[PDB]
Each structure stands twice: as C-alpha cells, then as structure tokens.
Amino acid sequence: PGPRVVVIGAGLAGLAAAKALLEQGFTDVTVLEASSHIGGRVQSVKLGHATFELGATWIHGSHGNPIYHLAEANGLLENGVACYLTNHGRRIPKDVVEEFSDLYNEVYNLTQEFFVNAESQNSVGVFTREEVRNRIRNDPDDPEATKRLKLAMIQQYLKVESCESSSHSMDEVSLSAFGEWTEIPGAHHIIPSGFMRVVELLAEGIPAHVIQLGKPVRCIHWDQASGSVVVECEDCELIPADHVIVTVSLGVLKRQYTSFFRPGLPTEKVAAIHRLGIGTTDKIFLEFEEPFWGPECNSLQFVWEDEAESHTLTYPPELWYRKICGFDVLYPPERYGHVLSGWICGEEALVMETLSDEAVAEICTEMLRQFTGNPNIPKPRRILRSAWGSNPYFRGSYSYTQVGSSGADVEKLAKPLPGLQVLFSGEATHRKYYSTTHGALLSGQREAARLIEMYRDLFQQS
Amino acid sequence: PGPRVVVIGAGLAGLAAAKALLEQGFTDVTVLEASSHIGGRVQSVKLGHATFELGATWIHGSHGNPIYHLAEANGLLENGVACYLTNHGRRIPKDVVEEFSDLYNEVYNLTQEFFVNAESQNSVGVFTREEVRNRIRNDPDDPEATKRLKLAMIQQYLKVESCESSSHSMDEVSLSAFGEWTEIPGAHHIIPSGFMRVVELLAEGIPAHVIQLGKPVRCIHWDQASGSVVVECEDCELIPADHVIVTVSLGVLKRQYTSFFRPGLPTEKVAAIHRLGIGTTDKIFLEFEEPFWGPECNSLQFVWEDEAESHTLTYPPELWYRKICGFDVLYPPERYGHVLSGWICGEEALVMETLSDEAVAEICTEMLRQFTGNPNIPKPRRILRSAWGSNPYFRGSYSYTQVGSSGADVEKLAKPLPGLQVLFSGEATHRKYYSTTHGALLSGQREAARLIEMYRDLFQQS
Ligand SMILES: C=C=CCNCCCC/N=C/C=C(\C)N1c2cc(C)c(C)cc2N(C[C@H](O)[C@H](O)[C@H](O)COP(=O)(O)OP(=O)(O)OC[C@H]2O[C@@H](n3cnc4c(N)ncnc43)[C@H](O)[C@@H]2O)c2[nH]c(=O)[nH]c(=O)c21
Ligand SMILES: C=C=CCNCCCC/N=C/C=C(\C)N1c2cc(C)c(C)cc2N(C[C@H](O)[C@H](O)[C@H](O)COP(=O)(O)OP(=O)(O)OC[C@H]2O[C@@H](n3cnc4c(N)ncnc43)[C@H](O)[C@@H]2O)c2[nH]c(=O)[nH]c(=O)c21
Ligand SMILES: Oc1ccc(Nc2nc(-c3cnc4ccccn34)cs2)cc1
Numbered sequence: 001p002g003p004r005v006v007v008i009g010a011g012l013a014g015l016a017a018a019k020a021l022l023e024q025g026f027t028d029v030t031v032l033e034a035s036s037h038i039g040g041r042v043q044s045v046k047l048g049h050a051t052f053e054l055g056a057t058w059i060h061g062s063h064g065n066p067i068y069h070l071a072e073a074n075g076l077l078e079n080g081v082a083c084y085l086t087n088h089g090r091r092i093p094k095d096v097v098e099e100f101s102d103l104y105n106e107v108y109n110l111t112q113e114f115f116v117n118a119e120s121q122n123s124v125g126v127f128t129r130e131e132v133r134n135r136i137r138n139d140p141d142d143p144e145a146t147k148r149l150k151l152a153m154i155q156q157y158l159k160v161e162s163c164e165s166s167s168h169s170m171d172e173v174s175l176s177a178f179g180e181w182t183e184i185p186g187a188h189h190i191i192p193s194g195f196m197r198v199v200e201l202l203a204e205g206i207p208a209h210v211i212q213l214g215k216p217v218r219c220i221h222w223d224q225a226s227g228s229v230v231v232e233c234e235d236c237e238l239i240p241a242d243h244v245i246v247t248v249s250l251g252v253l254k255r256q257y258t259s260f261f262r263p264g265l266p267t268e269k270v271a272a273i274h275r276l277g278i279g280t281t282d283k284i285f286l287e288f289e290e291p292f293w294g295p296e297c298n299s300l301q302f303v304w305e306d307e308a309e310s311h312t313l314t315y316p317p318e319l320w321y322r323k324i325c326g327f328d329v330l331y332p333p334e335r336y337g338h339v340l341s342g343w344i345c346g347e348e349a350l351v352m353e354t355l356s357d358e359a360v361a362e363i364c365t366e367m368l369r370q371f372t373g374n375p376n377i378p379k380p381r382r383i384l385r386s387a388w389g390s391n392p393y394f395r396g397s398y399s400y401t402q403v404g405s406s407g408a409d410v411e412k413l414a415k416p417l418p419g420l421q422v423l424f425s426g427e428a429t430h431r432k433y434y435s436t437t438h439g440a441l442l443s444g445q446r447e448a449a450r451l452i453e454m455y456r457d458l459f460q461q462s
Numbered sequence: 463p464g465p466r467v468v469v470i471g472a473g474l475a476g477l478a479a480a481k482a483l484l485e486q487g488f489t490d491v492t493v494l495e496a497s498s499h500i501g502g503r504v505q506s507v508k509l510g511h512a513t514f515e516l517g518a519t520w521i522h523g524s525h526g527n528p529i530y531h532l533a534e535a536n537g538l539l540e541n542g543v544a545c546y547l548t549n550h551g552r553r554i555p556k557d558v559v560e561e562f563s564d565l566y567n568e569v570y571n572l573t574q575e576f577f578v579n580a581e582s583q584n585s586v587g588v589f590t591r592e593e594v595r596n597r598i599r600n601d602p603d604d605p606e607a608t609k610r611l612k613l614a615m616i617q618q619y620l621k622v623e624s625c626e627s628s629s630h631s632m633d634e635v636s637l638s639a640f641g642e643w644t645e646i647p648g649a650h651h652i653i654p655s656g657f658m659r660v661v662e663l664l665a666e667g668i669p670a671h672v673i674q675l676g677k678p679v680r681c682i683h684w685d686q687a688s689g690s691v692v693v694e695c696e697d698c699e700l701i702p703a704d705h706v707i708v709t710v711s712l713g714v715l716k717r718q719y720t721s722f723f724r725p726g727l728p729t730e731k732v733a734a735i736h737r738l739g740i741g742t743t744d745k746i747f748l749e750f751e752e753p754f755w756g757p758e759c760n761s762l763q764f765v766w767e768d769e770a771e772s773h774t775l776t777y778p779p780e781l782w783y784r785k786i787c788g789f790d791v792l793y794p795p796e797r798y799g800h801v802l803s804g805w806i807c808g809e810e811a812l813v814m815e816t817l818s819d820e821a822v823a824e825i826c827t828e829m830l831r832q833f834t835g836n837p838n839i840p841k842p843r844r845i846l847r848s849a850w851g852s853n854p855y856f857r858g859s860y861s862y863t864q865v866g867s868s869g870a871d872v873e874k875l876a877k878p879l880p881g882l883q884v885l886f887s888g889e890a891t892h893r894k895y896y897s898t899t900h901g902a903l904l905s906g907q908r909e910a911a912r913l914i915e916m917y918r919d920l921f922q923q924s
C-alpha cells in the first residue's frame with residue numbers, strides 16, 4: 001500500500017502534517033481527531049455578523065510567517081486611551097499612570113541589559129519590581145496616597161505579564177514618547193471573517209475520508225515484533241500503522257503519557273514533559289445593551305489599592321476574579337456591539353471554568369460597578385468564554401518557558417522514537433515559535449518532511 | 463506453547479473453568495479479574511469471631527451439589543416465631559397471621575395446579591393475590607379493621623417473593639400443619655467460617671501467576687485474520703489468545719456488550735442479553751448493643767396498614783425503605799451478637815446504595831421505632847451492607863426468569879462464538895441452576911470441558 005500514517009489531532013499541526021504528506025502522494029494517511037471539530041486551539045464563534053475568537057486571536061508577524069502568507073493570499077486581512085480605575089470607584093490620574101509607566105519601562109530596560117534563556121527571564125521581572133517598589137517608596141516628592149496607588153499598579157502590571165508565553169512576546173511592545181504602550185505597527189493582524197478560515201484553507205486540500213472526527217486515541221503501541229505500530233482508540237478500534245505523528249497539547253501529554261505509550265517513553269522525554277510548562281489562558285466576552293464606559297477608554301484597567309504590599313502569584317479560589325487585570329473595549333462598536341473582552345491566566349482560570357455563566361457574569365458585573373463608581377450597570381445581555389484548562393483534549397492554552405526548563409527540553413520532546421515509529425509535533429515542539437499558530441503549523445511540516453525524506457531515500461535506494 | 467486461554471473474571475465460574483483446564487494440563491492459562499479479590503458474588507466479611515455474607519449465603523441442596531461436596535469434604539458445615547408488626551406500633555395477632563397464611567397457601571397451591579415456564583410463573587402470583595384479595599373483602603365473618611391488616615399482608619408477602627430468582631426457589635418452602643412456613647430440613651446450609659472458604663478451596667489448585675487481580679477487560683477482539691483473538695484490558699495491555707471464557711455477570715453484559723465485543727455479537731445473543739433479567743438484591747446488617755426485639759421473635763415483619771389497596775411493584779425514591787419486608791434476628795446471639803439481617807430487592811435497592819451508612823442506619827432505626835412502638839431504640843453501633851447493583855463489575859445480584867424470556871434465551875447466551883474463540887460462562891448461562899453458586903461453578907466446568915474435548919480430539923487426530 002505504501003506507508004500507513006496515523007496523525008493524532010486535527011489542529012494546525014495535524015492538518016499541516018497531513019496536507020504535506022498528501023501533497024507528496026502519501027496515499028495511506030488517516031487523521032484521528034478527539035473533538036467533533038478541526039482547528040484545535042483555533043476556535044472561532046459567530047454572533048450576529050461578527051466573529052469572536054475563543055483560542056488563537058492574532059497573526060504575530062508578516063513576511064516569512066506561513067499563516068500570514070495564507071491569510072494575505074486569500075484576502076482575509078486589513079480610538080482612545082487605557083482607563084486605570086481603583087476598586088473604591090475613583091479613577092487614577094493621567095500623571096500618576098504615565099509616571100509609573102515611565103519608571104517601570106526605565107527599570108525593566110536597565111534590568112534586561114543586566115541579564116537570553118528561560119531561568120534568566122524570571123530574574124528580570126523579580127528585580128525590576130523590587131527596584132521599582134524601592135524608588136516609589138523612596139521618592140521624597142510624592143504624597144503617601146499616590147505611592148499606595150503606584151505600588152498597586154506593580155501587581156496590576158504583573159497580572160498583564162502572567163498571560164505571556166515568554167519575555168520575547170513582551171519585547172514586541174515598547175513605551176511611546178507620550179507615555180502609551182505602543183505595539184509595532186504591522187506586528188499583530190486579526191481575521192475579521194474568523195481565524196477558523198485559515199484552518200479551513202489549510203484543510204481544503206485534504207480528502208474528507210482522511211479526517212476521523214469524534215475519534216480520540218487511548219494508547220499508542222510501538223516497538224511491536226502487519227504494522228509494528230498499533231493505535232488504540234477509546235471506542236476500542238485497533239488501527240495498525242508504520243508511523244504515527246502525535247500533535248496533542250503538552251497538557252494532554254502531562255496527564256496521559258503513562259497510559260498513552262506502550263512501552264513507556266524514554267526517560268529524557270518524560271523529564272522534558274515534566275520540565276516544560278503549559279499555562280491555562282481563557283477569554284471572557286461581556287456583551288452589554290450599551291456602553292457605560294467613557295468614549296476615551298480603549299480599556300478598563302483594575303488597580304486594587306489593598307494590593308500595594310502583596311508579592312502574590314496565585315490567589316485563593318474565592319479571589320479568582322482578582323487575576324483579571326482589566327477589560328478591552330472591542331472596536332468598532334458597529335461590528336462587535338458594546339462588548340468588553342477580558343483575559344484570565346493560571347490556576348484562577350481553572351477556578352473560573354468550574355463556575356456557571358450566570359455566576360461569572362454576576363462577579364464581572366459586581367467588579368465593573370465597584371471600579372466605575374456606577375452601581376446601576378445591568379447584567380450583560382450575553383456572555384461568551386473558553387475552557388481550555390478543563391477540556392481533556394487541551395488541558396492548557398499554550399506552552400511557556402518555565403523556570404527550570406530550557407530549549408534542550410523542546411528538542412527532547414520533539415525527538416522521534418526509534419524507526420520514526422512515533423513522531424512528536426505541536427506548538428510546544430517548536431524551538432522558537434512555541435505557543436503560536438505558525439509554530440504549530442511549522443512543527444507539523446517538520447515531522448511530515450521527516451517521513452517525506454525517509455521515503456524519497458527508499459525510492460532513491462529502491 | 464499449546465492453546466492460549468484467557469478466562470475473564472475470578473468468581474466461582476472463572477475459578478472452576480481455570481482449575482478444570484489446569485487439571486487437564488492446560489499450561490498457557492491466564493485469569494483476568496477486575497476487582498482486587500477473587501470469589502465475585504461470594505463475599506465474606508469478618509467482625510469479631512463471626513463472618514457476615516454480603517453475597518451468596520446458603521448452599522441450596524445436598525448430594526449432587528458440587529459446592530455441598532466441597533463444603534462437606536473439608537468439614538465446613540453443621541428458636542421462636544416470626545413477629546408481624548403494624549406501622550402504628552401495634553402487633554398483629556397469631557390468629558390473623560395464621561388465617562392469612564393458610565388462605566394464601568390454599569389459593570397459591572390451587573392456582574399453581576391451574577398453571578412450568580417463565581411467563582406462566584407470573585400469572586400464579588397475579589391471580590393468587592386477586593383471589594386472596596376477593597375472599598378477604600368477601601368474608602362476612604371478619605371485622606373491617608382485621609380485613610385492612612390481612613389485605614396489607616398481600617403487599618408484605620409480595621415484597622418477600624420479589625427477592626426470589628424463580629417460582630422453583632419459592633417451591634422449596636411449604637406451610638406446616640401449625641401455620642408456620644417450614645423449609646425442607648437439609649435444603650439450606652451456612653458455612654460459619656465463611657462462604658469464601660469454598661472459593662479458596664476451589665482456587666487452591668491454581669498457581670499464583672495465573673490469576674491477575676485488579677485487571678479489568680475493556681474489549682474482546684475476535685474473528686481476527688499470532689492469536690486470532692486479542693483481549694484489550696482497561697490499562698491498554700493487548701493479550702493475544704486462541705480462546706476466551708467470559709464469566710462477567712448478565713448485568714455487566716447488558717451495560718457493555720456494544721463496546722466489549724469487536725465485531726459485535728450475533729443478534730440472537732444480543733436479543734437474549736436484552737430478554738434475560740438480572741435483579742439487584744442487597745443485604746443490610748444492623749448490629750445493636752442489646753436486643754429490643756422480644757425473645758419469641760425469629761424476625762420482625764413490616765405490614766404497612768395504608769398498603770391495603772395498593773398493587774405496587776416499584777416505590778418512589780423517597781419510599782425506598784418500604785421495599786424491606788422485615789428483618790431476621792441472627793442466631794445464635796453469642797456468634798453474631800444482637801444483629802438484625804435485612805434484604806432489599808429491585809430499583810429501591812439501587813436507591814439505598816446511593817445513601818451513606820449514617821443515612822441508611824437512621825431510616826432503619828426510624829422504621830424499627832415506629833413498628834415496635836418503642837421510640838427509645840438507639841442508633842445501631844455498627845451497620846454493614848452490599849452494593850451489587852452500582853458496582854460496575856456486577857451491576858446486579860443474580861439472573862431471574864423475566865416475563866417475556868425463556869430457557870431458549872439461556873441456551874442463546876451460553877452458545878460459543880465460532881471456532882470456540884469466545885465461550886460464555888457464569889450463573890446466568892446455566893439452564894436450571896442460574897442464580898446459584900453451583901450453577902456458576904458448573905457453567906465454568908461446561909466451557910472448560912468444551913476446550914478440553916476440542917484438544918483431546920486434536921490429540922486423537924494428531
Ligand atoms: C493594548 C493592549 C493589550 C493587548 N495585549 C496583547 C498581548 C497578546 C499576546 N498574544 C497572545 C496570543 C494568544 C494568547 N493566542 C492564543 C490564545 C488562546 C486562548 C489559546 C488557547 C491559544 C493561543 N495561541 C496558541 C495557538 O492557538 C496554538 O499554539 C495552536 O493552535 C496549537 O496548534 P496544535 O500544536 O496543532 O495543537 P492543537 O491543540 O490546536 O491540536 C491538537 C489536536 O489534538 C486533539 N486531540 C487531543 N487529544 C487527542 C487524542 N487523545 N486523540 C486524538 N486527538 C486528540 C485536540 O482536540 C486538537 O484538535 C495563539 N497563537 C497565535 O498564533 N496567536 C494568538 O494570538 C494566540
Ligand atoms: C424464615 C425465612 C426467610 C428466609 N428466606 C430464605 C430465602 C433464601 C433464598 N436464597 C437466596 C439466595 C441468595 C439471595 N444468594 C445470593 C445473594 C446475593 C446478595 C448475591 C449477590 C448472590 C447470591 N447468589 C448467587 C451467586 O452468588 C452467584 O450466582 C455466583 O456467585 C455467581 O458466580 P459467577 O457466575 O462466576 O459470577 P461472578 O460475578 O461472582 O464472577 C465474575 C467475575 O468477573 C469479574 N469481572 C467483571 N467485569 C470484568 C471485566 N470487565 N474484566 C475482568 N473481570 C471482570 C467480577 O469482578 C467477578 O469477580 C446465591 N447463590 C447461592 O448459591 N446461594 C445463595 O444463597 C445466594
Ligand atoms: O501588545 C501589547 C502588550 C502590552 C500592552 N500594554 C501594557 N503592557 C504592560 C506591561 C507590563 N509589564 C510590561 C513589561 C514590558 C512592557 C510592557 N509591560 C502593562 S499595560 C500593549 C500592547
């Protein structure tokens with residue numbers, strides 16, 4: 001028949017791998033997808049004539065980005081100030097916000113010269129914040145009331161950083177000569193029609209029989225003495241294979257590696273799985289009848305005055321809501337309506353995922369009332385939100401550079417099992433583009449290219 | 463190697479099968495048992511120097527019973543009146559109980575002449591009760607107060623019958639010339655040391671490596687084009703086999719047959735699985751500090767005066783307790799202490815299994831107070847009870863003759879799949895001894911004898 005290839009997962013990596021193989025005339029290819037849908041951590045949701053992204057939101061980069069090339073080639077591409085509010089209703093002055101912002105940028109840049117690896121990243125933030133904290137307290141020409149606001153903004157800024165995959169994702173943005181945090185102009189693009197359109201363009205080539213939806217794998221049996229690999233599905237089907245490409249998230253690997261592989265994985269790969277970090281990042285959309293936020297406001301930034309002294313990382317499960325750093329006003333209102341877009345990251349995101357919509361909605365409304373100083377804000381007409389952490393096909397949003405891991409661990413995760421029987425793909429297997437759509441895509445093409453090369457050589461031999 | 467034989471389950475049928483094969487020099491035998499223990503629906507529990515049975519309690523029969531032969535050969539074998547109480551505390555007179563008992567026995571025997579199959583069984587009870595109900599109401603020489611008691615005892619007697627596997631299990635007992643329900647003398651024997659001792663005597667022959675405890679099967683793959691059978695365990699191990707003997711309960715088959723077999727079972731077997739009935743029967747033990755029941759009382763029989771008109775079968779989930787027909791006083795007190803032994807059968811048993819011990823205990827204590835007329839009865843020191851229905855390795859206590867099934871369905875369940883690739887054992891596969899320990903044992907020996915015969919012939923051929 002030619003090589004039997006099972007691709008596990010139909011996110012960007014799985015589809016990229018399958019397309020690349022089929023493009024090379026690989027006849028005997030099957031994709032097994034656990035969920036009812038393709039796209040994985042690309043999940044687009046339509047409400048009215050407007051799309052909301054629950055997963056991947058922006059295309060990072062331009063020329064060279066193969067997902068930018070897709071979006072651009074099929075024509076899928078194309079205000080105010082941020083409003084800092086205290087938990088006692090009062091708004092923080094332009095001056096105070098600008099002063100803090102300037103101090104932080106000065107210290108963060110001076111510090112990043114001082115200290116490019118995963119452990120050394122952490123040190124920048126830790127010592128930045130200590131140095132910023134010292135200068136605020138030490139500044140003799142500041143009233144004590146204002147010092148307590150600025151010190152609380154350290155905790156606010158820390159919540160903003162929490163959602164980032166690296167320091168390098170936070171090295172895109174720099175501070176403007178007029179106190180605003182300006183991103184590089186052509187860096188981040190949205191797809192108004194939805195990010196799923198890219199998934200569908202990628203899947204277009206692939207025949208319909210290849211992709212098996214609602215078909216999760218239970219175990220990969222490799223090193224067999226017919227196919228020397230056997231894929232065991234949850235519905236108990238035994239699929240013989242020559243090669244397998246695993247694209248499931250690092251979070252799936254962390255929870256299932258002991259059962260998922262027979263025999264067990266080599267111990268350096270198991271160590272890599274443990275050492276590498278995957279974070280839970282969820283999106284919360286709050287659609288209101290009309291805007292209670294001022295027209296100058298791009299966003300509503302939450303500075304809790306009682307967090308001046310805290311060096312907190314994780315909140316208790318009652319204070320999960322305190323992990324939200326603020327809400328962005330979606331523009332334009334005509335496309336999206338009056339919708340606030342929020343992010344929550346880490347253990348507090350898993351706590352949010354357990355709550356019902358009416359509960360999450362209520363707590364966000366309570367927050368917004370307290371911060372705005374208007375207690376009359378109605379409950380939002382609609383709410384939309386993700387649950388990547390508790391979903392057993394994801395168990396996380398994206399891989400990040402954890403203190404006590406390295407680029408060495410990604411190479412170890414990405415390394416194939418002997419005879420290329422089992423190949424490792426997915427965002428977390430990409431050395432430099434991990435936690436992105438293009439990393440996911442390129443990782444799929446890498447493992448495909450590996451089998452492609454193996455059988456160009458068995459044509460060049462034979 | 464000689465034939466690879468996987469036996470699924472290490473209850474009486476699985477052990478009987480494995481022993482019989484090994485006795486015949488079958489080298490390559492494995493038993494896979496889901497639970498941590500052997501014995502299955504034989505489960506013995508020690509408290510003090512005394513054993514309580516949660517499953518199989520009595521050896522039914524003597525000479526010819528191969529479980530009697532075991533018990534007898536290893537030397538493991540060797541009061542008052544039943545007290546009928548109303549839910550308003552008052553005790554029902556000797557006369558009233560004897561009169562009812564005589565009427566019922568007369569009608570039940572006259573009726574059983576009128577109508578030996580599974581559907582025709584049901585008709586006996588239905589018309590017995592209607593005829594008994596008529597004569598009570600019709601009797602001109604009875605006060606109305608007494609008629610309402612006797613009519614409630616129909617519902618009581620119906621609860622007693624509910625726990626029986628057949629009419630033939632209720633054809634052992636007959637009525638004495640002095641109004642008592644007398645069992646045949648040498649019919650039922652207990653094992654004071656515990657029923658598990660029989661399980662252990664049966665397992666004695668078998669080497670330790672053969673039985674894999676804590677090892678449930680997920681799927682049997684048969685009809686494979688190495689072993690033409692593959693047993694798929696829950697921990698994802700693939701065990702190649704030539705023959706498999708399935709001994710799991712009818713309840714396990716009802717819930718799992720669609721996933722458990724690949725390809726699917728022949729449709730007459732699937733029909734047999736649906737047609738055959740398995741009931742949930744649980745035991746409740748209530749150990750008290752001292753006896754509040756009178757010394758004349760073998761048992762405390764519960765007659766609810768408000769059930770005179772009802773033709774109930776299933777109670778709602780709040781009235782689950784009403785399915786208990788009474789409690790037996792265990793004899794002798796020196797062995798067991800002051801322990802009441804109760805039975806609950808059907809859907810109401812599953813409702814009991816969901817409740818906590820403190821809850822079940824409380825409701826039984828409440829019942830006992832109301833019926834005795836003593837509200838001062840303390841909460842029992844200990845409680846012990848079974849959960850056969852909710853246990854996923856049982857999902858029932860024993861197979862019964864359901865209206866709309868026949869002996870034909872048992873033959874259909876018991877029939878092996880082609881090439882004797884998969885063999886069907888267990889109590890519910892025995893034509894006449896279903897719902898017994900000896901039926902279970904003999905069913906195991908039958909499937910063993912089948913493979914034994916197959917390979918005496920492949921020795922006589924070769
Ligand atoms: C002013 C002001 C302030 C504004 N601040 C701006 C800061 C913004 C910084 N950028 C942030 C971007 C985020 C957060 N973005 C973001 C947000 C959020 C909420 C998420 C969740 C992610 C992202 N990323 C990451 C990507 O989405 C992710 O890497 C890829 O989709 C993964 O593809 P894959 O490897 O194939 O895995 P998959 O999991 O997709 O596929 C594997 C499949 O396997 C299946 N499966 C599982 N188990 C199985 C089994 N047992 N058997 C069979 N199948 C099985 C499973 O169902 C899947 O379909 C982003 N990327 C990007 O490019 N742009 C972005 O903006 C974001
Ligand atoms: C005065 C006055 C009034 C007094 N009234 C007197 C009336 C009394 C009438 N007699 C009543 C008797 C009862 C109720 N008795 C009674 C009471 C109660 C509460 C019960 C629960 C039963 C009974 N019976 C029935 C037997 O116990 C039963 O038939 C056998 O144990 C079954 O053996 P097996 O077929 O091998 O199955 P198993 O299930 O045991 O074995 C299969 C194994 O498979 C395992 N398994 C499941 N799934 C698996 C997977 N996926 N992979 C691997 N393994 C898996 C599983 O864990 C098991 O170990 C009795 N029999 C008897 O002889 N005397 C009796 O007294 C009673
Ligand atoms: O694409 C972006 C990203 C961020 C922002 N805006 C804000 N950034 C920060 C912030 C926190 N920590 C640091 C460290 C370095 C630089 C910025 N920051 C606070 S608000 C706008 C556009």
Ligand SMILES: Oc1ccc(Nc2nc(-c3cnc4ccccn34)cs2)cc1
Nearest residue numbers: 570619620622623632634635643644645
């Ligand atoms: O091994 C036994 C079984 C039962 C009893 N005692 C009682 N049996 C009945 C009863 C109900 N229905 C019928 C129909 C026919 C015969 C009896 N019964 C009520 S109390 C004692 C020993």
Ligand SMILES: [Cl-]
Nearest residue numbers: 051052053057
């Ligand atoms: Cl969006």
Ligand SMILES: [Cl-]
Nearest residue numbers: 513514515519
């Ligand atoms: Cl007992």
